């Protein structure tokens, strides 16, 4: 009687070469249709909003200016409680922890995710 779910992330840091793409996966378990739910990511230090999906649409006017036109939320299997944060033209300033979360009405769990931005050369 409790849709109360645990949120799960990588479990190990995610790697990416500078100036590249990055994908951060996050899902809820048991998985369920997270289409109506609120999903989002925070950039660890000062909880800046990296990306926010709510009421079916991406809330663009609600993300930190530093991230505009740099993210995306893969929604292929959202009905499975699965999504992924994709980021373009990576930079070191993207190195560090992130925080993903799902809000099921008055319920809301989160998972910590971390990104390693390594230097090619």
């Amino acid at each position, epitope marked *: 009687g409790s*849709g109360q779910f645990r949120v799960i992330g990588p479990g190990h840091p995610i790697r990416a070469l500078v100036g590249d793409e990055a994908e951060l996966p996050c899902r809820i378990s048991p998985g369920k249709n997270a289409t109506g739910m609120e999903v989002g990511w925070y950039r660890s230090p000062f909880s800046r909003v990296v990306h926010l999906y709510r009421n079916g649409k991406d809330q663009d006017a609600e993300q930190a200016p530093e991230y505009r036109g740099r993210t995306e939320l893969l929604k292929e299997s959202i009905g499975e409680g699965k999504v992924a944060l994709r980021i373009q033209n990576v930079r070191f300033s993207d190195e560090g922890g992130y925080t993903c979360f799902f809000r099921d009405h008055s319920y809301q769990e989160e998972a910590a995710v971390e990104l390693k931005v390594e230097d090619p050369f």
Partner: antibody
Amino acid sequence: EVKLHESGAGLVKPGASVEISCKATGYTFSSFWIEWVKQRPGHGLEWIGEILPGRGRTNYNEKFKGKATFTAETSSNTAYMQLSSLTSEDSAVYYCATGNTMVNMPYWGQGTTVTVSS
Amino acid sequence: DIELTQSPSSLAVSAGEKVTMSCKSSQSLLNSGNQKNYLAWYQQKPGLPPKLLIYGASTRESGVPDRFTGSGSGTDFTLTISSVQAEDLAVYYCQNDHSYPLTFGAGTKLEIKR
């Protein structure tokens, strides 16, 4: 089994500060957003904001920004609200509500009264 | 901010009559992912807190008697009490339960004439 209870000084001097507290029992206190609602006779309900105990996340109503301030201590399953520079407008019955996976605010505390007056 | 207008501001009926309450929102209250209108109706009897009757524009909370029904969509909803009861005397508030800052209507007071 889920039930909230409110409490806090019922009489305070204008231009001071009151910290009404909300105690919750019957659940994993840290994963449900708590809502704070003001209500006064010549009016209906007012939504002040909410807070996610544990994460420590906050969302306030624009008009209450600066006026109100939330926090909580997992140690006691108590969420707090501190209204400041109290005014007669600040005279009312404040509630705190919580919810579940399908509804936000299905549970309401008994509410406590607060009157501002020197 | 979304504003909610309730009407009548109050009405009186006798036990057993059908009653219908209005609440008209200034904005849409539809979540696209749910394809559901996030509106709620609360009953408030004198002295205690508000009771939640229906959420999502038309879904009954556990326990609430079936004589209570909330329909609507778009910016216009309505609460209907099939056959009024004495204990149904109270104040009824409707609430934007989808967009911040949350907002409640002015309420519709229901008197019981006899």
